[PDB]
């Protein structure tokens, strides 16, 4: 049990670290998805707004 | 060509309105999920403090 605990603790710590890595990667995806949407629909949708004007004339 | 007019406006108005709204609506959902991340950070700190 001491080893099972160290192993479970390794797993708990692993999971805390894995969760930490994923806390970081979820935030990176939360920020990257955010940034990509924020820049991508905001720019390309803006480019389609610009289409409204670009294709006028 | 009433259709060019229908399309020039439908493309812009339907999308800018629906799309920009999704940007800000989700920005708030995302901010709340980011708050959840902060609350998990708080939860982890509190468990350690206890």
């Amino acid at each position: 049990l001491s080893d099972k605990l160290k192993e479970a603790e390794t797993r708990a710590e692993f999971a805390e670290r894995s969760v930490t890595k994923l806390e970081k990667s979820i935030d990176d995806l939360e920020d990257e998805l955010y940034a990509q949407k924020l820049k991508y629909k905001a720019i390309s949708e803006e480019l389609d707004h610009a289409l409204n004007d670009m294709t006028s004339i | 060509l009433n259709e060019l007019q229908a399309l020039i406006e439908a493309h812009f108005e339907n999308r800018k309105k629906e799309e920009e709204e999704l940007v800000s609506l989700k920005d708030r959902i995302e901010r709340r999920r980011a708050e959840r991340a902060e609350q998990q950070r708080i939860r982890n700190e509190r468990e350690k403090e206890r």
Binding site: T55, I57 | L1, L4, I8
Partner: peptide, 29 residues
Amino acid sequence: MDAIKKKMQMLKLDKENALDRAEQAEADK
């Protein structure tokens, strides 16, 4: 930019027709 593929065609027709006339007007002598 289909709006202008279509506007292009309209103006193309307007000029082609004006041009057809420019060419005829000169051709008529």
